[PDB]
Design an enzyme around this catalytic site. Sequence first.
Site, short mmCIF file in Angstrom:
data_model
loop_
_atom_site.label_atom_id
_atom_site.label_comp_id
_atom_site.label_asym_id
_atom_site.label_seq_id
_atom_site.Cartn_x
_atom_site.Cartn_y
_atom_site.Cartn_z
N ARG A 56 -9.72 9.82 -13.60
CA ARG A 56 -10.33 10.92 -14.38
C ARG A 56 -10.75 12.10 -13.49
NH1 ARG A 56 -11.78 5.94 -16.15
NH2 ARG A 56 -10.92 5.59 -18.24
N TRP A 62 -5.02 9.68 -15.88
CA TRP A 62 -5.29 10.14 -17.27
C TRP A 62 -5.38 11.68 -17.34
CZ3 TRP A 62 -3.43 5.96 -17.93
CH2 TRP A 62 -4.06 4.71 -17.95
N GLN A 104 -14.00 -2.42 -10.39
CA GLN A 104 -13.07 -2.15 -11.50
C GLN A 104 -11.65 -1.95 -10.94
OE1 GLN A 104 -15.07 0.55 -14.58
NE2 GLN A 104 -16.45 0.69 -12.80
N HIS A 124 -11.26 -5.95 -13.67
CA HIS A 124 -10.04 -5.51 -14.38
C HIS A 124 -8.83 -6.22 -13.75
CE1 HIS A 124 -12.50 -1.66 -15.54
NE2 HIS A 124 -13.01 -2.83 -16.02
N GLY A 198 -17.70 6.04 -6.29
CA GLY A 198 -16.44 6.51 -6.88
C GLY A 198 -16.14 5.81 -8.20
N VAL A 242 -17.04 9.79 -0.57
CA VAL A 242 -17.69 8.47 -0.34
C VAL A 242 -17.52 8.05 1.13
CG1 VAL A 242 -15.77 7.00 -1.24
CG2 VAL A 242 -18.15 6.19 -1.23
N1 LIG Z 1 -13.42 10.62 -2.09
C1 LIG Z 1 -14.21 10.52 -3.16
N2 LIG Z 1 -15.54 10.39 -2.96
C2 LIG Z 1 -16.35 10.23 -4.01
N3 LIG Z 1 -16.07 10.22 -5.30
C3 LIG Z 1 -14.74 10.34 -5.48
C4 LIG Z 1 -13.78 10.52 -4.51
N4 LIG Z 1 -12.52 10.63 -5.10
C5 LIG Z 1 -12.75 10.53 -6.39
N5 LIG Z 1 -14.08 10.38 -6.68
C6 LIG Z 1 -14.71 10.23 -7.99
O1 LIG Z 1 -14.57 8.89 -8.36
C7 LIG Z 1 -14.59 8.75 -9.81
C8 LIG Z 1 -13.62 7.68 -10.22
O2 LIG Z 1 -13.78 7.45 -11.67
P1 LIG Z 1 -12.54 7.17 -12.61
O3 LIG Z 1 -11.35 7.97 -12.16
O4 LIG Z 1 -13.00 7.20 -14.03
O5 LIG Z 1 -12.16 5.63 -12.24
P2 LIG Z 1 -13.00 4.30 -12.64
O6 LIG Z 1 -12.98 3.31 -11.52
O7 LIG Z 1 -14.37 4.77 -13.02
O8 LIG Z 1 -12.17 3.80 -13.89
C9 LIG Z 1 -12.61 2.63 -14.61
C10 LIG Z 1 -11.39 2.06 -15.29
O9 LIG Z 1 -10.86 3.06 -16.21
C11 LIG Z 1 -9.43 3.11 -16.13
O10 LIG Z 1 -8.87 3.21 -17.44
C12 LIG Z 1 -9.07 1.81 -15.40
O11 LIG Z 1 -9.12 0.70 -16.27
C13 LIG Z 1 -10.23 1.65 -14.40
O12 LIG Z 1 -10.43 0.33 -13.90
C14 LIG Z 1 -14.30 10.14 -10.37
O13 LIG Z 1 -15.34 10.63 -11.19
C15 LIG Z 1 -14.09 11.03 -9.13
O14 LIG Z 1 -14.75 12.26 -9.27
N1 LIG Z 2 -6.27 4.71 -9.43
C1 LIG Z 2 -5.37 3.78 -9.76
C2 LIG Z 2 -4.27 4.34 -10.45
C3 LIG Z 2 -3.27 3.51 -10.96
C4 LIG Z 2 -3.36 2.12 -10.74
S1 LIG Z 2 -2.07 1.14 -11.41
O1 LIG Z 2 -0.64 1.93 -11.38
O2 LIG Z 2 -1.91 -0.20 -10.59
N2 LIG Z 2 -2.12 0.79 -13.15
C5 LIG Z 2 -3.11 -0.28 -13.48
C6 LIG Z 2 -3.31 -0.47 -15.03
N3 LIG Z 2 -3.51 0.87 -15.74
C7 LIG Z 2 -3.39 0.72 -17.27
C8 LIG Z 2 -4.49 -0.06 -17.88
C9 LIG Z 2 -4.51 -1.16 -18.75
C10 LIG Z 2 -5.79 -1.66 -19.13
C11 LIG Z 2 -6.92 -1.00 -18.63
C12 LIG Z 2 -8.32 -1.33 -18.85
C13 LIG Z 2 -8.75 -2.68 -18.63
C14 LIG Z 2 -10.11 -3.10 -18.79
C15 LIG Z 2 -11.09 -2.19 -19.21
C16 LIG Z 2 -10.71 -0.85 -19.43
C17 LIG Z 2 -9.35 -0.41 -19.25
F1 LIG Z 2 -9.12 0.87 -19.48
S2 LIG Z 2 -6.18 0.28 -17.64
C18 LIG Z 2 -2.53 1.94 -15.35
C19 LIG Z 2 -2.43 2.08 -13.83
C20 LIG Z 2 -4.45 1.58 -10.03
C21 LIG Z 2 -5.49 2.35 -9.53
S3 LIG Z 2 -6.82 1.43 -8.69
N4 LIG Z 2 -7.19 1.98 -7.09
O3 LIG Z 2 -6.54 -0.14 -8.56
O4 LIG Z 2 -8.17 1.63 -9.52
#
Ligand SMILES: Nc1ncnc2c1ncn2[C@@H]1O[C@H](COP(=O)(O)OP(=O)(O)OC[C@H]2O[C@H](O)[C@H](O)[C@@H]2O)[C@@H](O)[C@H]1O
Ligand SMILES: Nc1ccc(S(=O)(=O)N2CCN(Cc3ccc(-c4ccccc4F)s3)CC2)cc1S(N)(=O)=O
Length: 282
Positions: A56, A62, A104, A124, A198, A242
């Site tokens: 995001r 996304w 996650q 996840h 992050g 971070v």
């Molecule tokens: N170098 C950095 N330093 C600090 N913050 C950072 C950096 N790079 C990016 N960010 C921030 O890091 C944040 C990353 O937030 P998000 O991208 O929502 O990832 P999630 O782990 O919360 O996604 C949760 C699940 O949603 C998905 O559907 C999958 O299922 C995932 O498992 C951002 O707000 C960036 O600004």
């Molecule tokens: N940064 C990034 C970008 C892409 C990938 S990935 O190519 O390996 N691939 C992974 C599965 N998603 C689809 C999902 C299917 C279901 C989802 C979901 C499960 C539970 C609760 C809420 C949810 F939204 S997310 C696509 C990307 C990995 C990462 S990372 N560094 O491991 O976080």
Amino acid sequence: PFTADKGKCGLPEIFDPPEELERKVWELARLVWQSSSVVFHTGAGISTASGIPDFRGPHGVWTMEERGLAPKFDTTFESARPTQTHMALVQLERVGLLRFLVSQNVDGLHVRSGFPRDKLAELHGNMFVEECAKCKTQYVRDTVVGTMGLKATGRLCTVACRGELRDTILDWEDSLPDRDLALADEASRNADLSITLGTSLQIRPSGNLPLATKRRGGRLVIVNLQPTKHDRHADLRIHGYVDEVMTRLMKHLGLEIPAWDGPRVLERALPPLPRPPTPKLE
Ligand SMILES: Nc1ncnc2c1ncn2[C@@H]1O[C@H](COP(=O)(O)OP(=O)(O)OC[C@H]2O[C@H](O)[C@H](O)[C@@H]2O)[C@@H](O)[C@H]1O
Ligand SMILES: Nc1ccc(S(=O)(=O)N2CCN(Cc3ccc(-c4ccccc4F)s3)CC2)cc1S(N)(=O)=O
Ligand SMILES: [Cl-]
Ligand SMILES: [Cl-]
Ligand SMILES: [Zn+2]
């Protein structure tokens, strides 16, 4: 799955100026020193400095989908190296300063960093991990398991079983693993310090677990370039990269960030190492 709500994407980054950042990382040091029980919560932001785009952020998977663009990888999951933040969390657990790590991230990098699996919740799932449908035995592979959505990979179980092996990657509909979530909840409730790294905290129940620390007087620190869902509930927000926050903290704590040996799997936490004596605070 086409219509699955992907939350708020591509909100503006915040950068604290250097003096304010330096002052906030010292206060984070002060909270780690005072805390009996520190839990860290990690999201895709800890893996952006290793070439893996987040979801995001401005160039998130996304976010770019919403604008009709492609996310950009600078690495494969297999060639990806754990960051400074990944290796800082390895060391913080080894000297007893981190109690539990909730992630996650499906990128496999906490496990490859040498982080003990018995102190990790992979909410996840893990791209390198397949699980036997019968004996629930897990395998940590040196290559990514080629399927997603708890499907059959085509391999069978070797337990002294022939059970069908399946991936650990949750689809949108699939609920979290009971073991990891229960352990994540428990560590979160009992923590006096929860630090989010992050994550934008938008996913239930993953993104709500740090709030459980807030019940019975625990402190919440959010480290993130963008706003997160729970910014209101945080004792301290740090808008920086971070890697910079974690290297500055480690330096304040007296701790070196250790060398990565290359991919390794630790199942069980080793006995704690010596750590520096604590500064006088008040
Ligand atoms: N170098 C950095 N330093 C600090 N913050 C950072 C950096 N790079 C990016 N960010 C921030 O890091 C944040 C990353 O937030 P998000 O991208 O929502 O990832 P999630 O782990 O919360 O996604 C949760 C699940 O949603 C998905 O559907 C999958 O299922 C995932 O498992 C951002 O707000 C960036 O600004
Ligand atoms: N940064 C990034 C970008 C892409 C990938 S990935 O190519 O390996 N691939 C992974 C599965 N998603 C689809 C999902 C299917 C279901 C989802 C979901 C499960 C539970 C609760 C809420 C949810 F939204 S997310 C696509 C990307 C990995 C990462 S990372 N560094 O491991 O976080
Ligand atoms: Cl991929
Ligand atoms: Cl150790
Ligand atoms: Zn089996």
